[PDB]
Design a protein around this ligand. Structure first.
Ligand SMILES: [Mg+2]
Ligand SMILES: [Mg+2]
Ligand SMILES: [Mg+2]
Ligand SMILES: [Mg+2]
Ligand SMILES: [Mg+2]
Lengths: 250, 251
């Protein structure tokens, strides 16, 4: 199932639209009793969507795999993982913080479902991660306490920067269905995809845009280096003020 | 869970499996996935207890994953994950009218496309960044190459499309403590547990000084966003000038 629990958490919350108009609290359940003893359930039968919690991420995965785009009284089904409600980004992490540590530190704010540290295709800490709370109230606190205060995790004072999680969708995307529903759209369609030939407006334009784009890049990278350099110096600055005062008392 | 005539045995369908016993053979492997239908392609480092198999379908591979990951097998628990796409690009500067379908249409031109998607926010509005997945790497190089060489346009509006290699991040496995390298620089960061620093201490002053450098950095970068935006709108009307009246001579 899932050893050492993390049962019936928001990561086991699935969503389902395109419910036919004749649906009960009970028929829903009957649809997902294959995958065991359900948790919190919600339906707005009016608007033909519903939510369900399963015991485990795995069950939720299988359910989803099994019940997506399958019929129920004419209607094909929309199974999706539900977007977590109590989720923060964290940044400025010591390369030496672990998923475990980050979870540990954050529990001081209320029960945690999960906490992860985002890693590169080389598995190196990217310096960001996610913290996922059970409830929202805990996430409120976290985000407040940490904006108001200075939360540190390791010896070297790296202050945690905590933001609300921005949630992107890269699975559904922008389907044609929804696209067409726009005026500018049909105009934008009229001229197909293409490489633009030297000689045309399109050309001299985009070559120039490209340049502006390249510039912006350098500009941005330049800023990052400045402020990088600033940040390293500030180390070498404060030292004097304080560290030296601890070599005077000693 | 399926759609007749949906291109099958894609990279979206490739599973990696670690922690196989060193006494594994091809034929043990294919039967572990016996229940998930007709096995596609297989590779195995028998010396390194790891391997890959393609299945028919995303939905299958999901279930296989959910089912087998962490399952015991002659001593070890298997690690089973989705294999990291090898033929994948980031694309940016999308008119928010471009769609998954289009993006696919547009890039097929380079080679067969496993999948093309536009990344949409919570409001379902395009963010102008999107992903393109090819069957093969050639397809992805050729598509990067032309597109850095040339200028590639999608729509009547000449928004030129930028292509990068797709930077692949892990938010699943993450960085477990086990994996944290118990080098010196390790326990020595841990010597001091989590805490809020107190007003007056060094930890504090440093950290608030840092914070300010941080928010500065922010603003400065938003500023560059602002600068260039304007330059880009100036360029727009500029060009509309140098030409629409060449178009007025063509009227
Ligand atoms: Mg009831
Ligand atoms: Mg009830
Ligand atoms: Mg505890
Ligand atoms: Mg930075
Ligand atoms: Mg420890």
């Amino acid at each position: 199932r899932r050893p050492g629990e993390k049962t019936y958490t928001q990561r086991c919350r699935l969503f389902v639209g395109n419910l036919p108009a004749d649906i009960t609290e009970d028929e829903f359940k009957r649809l997902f009793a294959k995958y065991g003893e359900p948790g919190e359930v919600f339906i707005n039968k009016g608007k033909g969507f519903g939510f369900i919690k399963l015991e485990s991420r795995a069950l939720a995965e299988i359910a989803k795999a099994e019940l997506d785009d399958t019929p129920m009284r004419g209607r094909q089904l929309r199974v999706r993982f539900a977007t977590h409600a109590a989720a923060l980004s964290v940044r400025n992490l010591s390369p030496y913080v672990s998923n475990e540590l980050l979870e540990e530190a954050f529990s001081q704010f209320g029960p945690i479902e999960r906490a992860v540290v985002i890693v590169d295709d080389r598995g190196r800490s990217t310096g960001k991660g996610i913290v996922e709370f059970a409830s929202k109230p805990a996430a409120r606190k976290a985000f407040e306490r940490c904006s108001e205060g200075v939360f540190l995790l390791t010896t070297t004072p790296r202050p945690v920067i905590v933001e609300p999680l921005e949630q992107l969708d890269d699975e559904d995307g922008l389907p044609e269905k929804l696209a067409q529903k726009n005026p500018m759209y049909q105009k934008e369609r009229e001229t197909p995809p293409r490489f633009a030939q030297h000689g045309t407006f399109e050309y001299e334009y985009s070559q120039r845009w490209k340049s502006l784009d390249e510039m912006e890049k350098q500009q941005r990278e330049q800023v990052e280096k400045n402020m990088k350099d600033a940040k390293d110096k500030l180390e070498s600055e404060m030292e004097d003020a304080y560290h030296e005062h601890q070599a005077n008392l000693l």
